[PDB]
DNA sequence: TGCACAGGATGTATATATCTGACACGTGCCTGGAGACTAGGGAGTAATCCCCTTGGCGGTTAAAACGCGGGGGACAGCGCGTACGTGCGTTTAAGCGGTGCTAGAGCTGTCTACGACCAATTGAGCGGCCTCGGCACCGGGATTCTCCAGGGCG
């Protein structure tokens, strides 16, 4: 909540957030980040180890078109 | 006899007339520009009510935060060999110049189904409600499932 409000502070001052639509942002963030951890996990498996590394997130990130 | 020369017999860049390709300029028929009528869709206001805040004490709990052991897994070093990198000659086949066709692509009347536009009914679908049987959470108990210590075995 305080994070979304923090991001909304410097955009439009004195806004209001409904009781809904926050669980949609958090839900999409969680569901997307889990898939990102799966693709990054596979990227770490391609290097033949059990550890996720900072370069793995960049590999699995940029390789998705970002 | 050994030798230099005067001129023909071939090359070769050099300069001139010649062949595509693309920019530049002059039209006239389907576009735009513009003028007037209708009107319903957009700008503006009057309550409203309704969930959303204001400010901060305490008490307590569950979650967040820190701290150390070490175990295993990331990771550097190094030798091997076979799997492509590199280099030849030999072949099959695309590029391209040119040809005879056609069958499907492409612009144009007819009318005729056939869907756009508009009254009248209603009933099937939406706001409101209030229950109970499926659901939430956990005990009881059996079951599996992994962790650690010999020891019989190297």
Curated annotation (Swiss-Prot):
It is found in: Nucleus; Chromosome. The modification N6-methyllysine is found at residue 12. The modification N6-succinyllysine is found at residue 12. The modification N6,N6-dimethyllysine is found at residue 12. Changing residue 12 to A/P/Q: Compromises telomeric silencing. It comes from the Eukaryota. Phosphorylated by IPL1 to form H3S10ph in a cell cycle-dependent manner during mitosis and meiosis. H3S10ph is also formed by SNF1, promotes subsequent H3K14ac formation by GCN5, and is required for transcriptional activation through TBP recruitment to the promoters. Dephosphorylation is performed by GLC7. The modification N6,N6,N6-trimethyllysine is found at residue 12. Core component of nucleosome. Nucleosomes wrap and compact DNA into chromatin, limiting DNA accessibility to the cellular machineries which require DNA as a template. Histones thereby play a central role in transcription regulation, DNA repair, DNA replication and chromosomal stability. DNA accessibility is regulated via a complex set of post-translational modifications of histones, also called histone code, and nucleosome remodeling. The nucleosome is a histone octamer containing two molecules each of H2A, H2B, H3 and H4 assembled in one H3-H4 heterotetramer and two H2A-H2B heterodimers. The octamer wraps approximately 147 bp of DNA. Histone H3 is a component of the UAF (upstream activation factor) complex, which consists of UAF30, RRN5, RRN9, RRN10, and histones H3 and H4. Present with 213000 molecules/cell in log phase SD medium. Belongs to the histone H3 family. This is Histone H3. The gene is HHT1. The chain holds residues 69 to 134 of 136 of the full protein.
């Amino acid at each position: 909540q305080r994070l979304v409000r923090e991001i909304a502070q410097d955009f439009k001052t004195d806004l209001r957030f409904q009781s809904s639509a926050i669980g949609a942002l958090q839900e999409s963030v969680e569901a997307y980040l889990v898939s990102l951890f799966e693709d990054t996990n596979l990227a770490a498996i391609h290097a033949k180890r059990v550890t996720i590394q900072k370069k793995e997130i960049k590999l699995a990130r940029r390789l998705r078109g970002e």
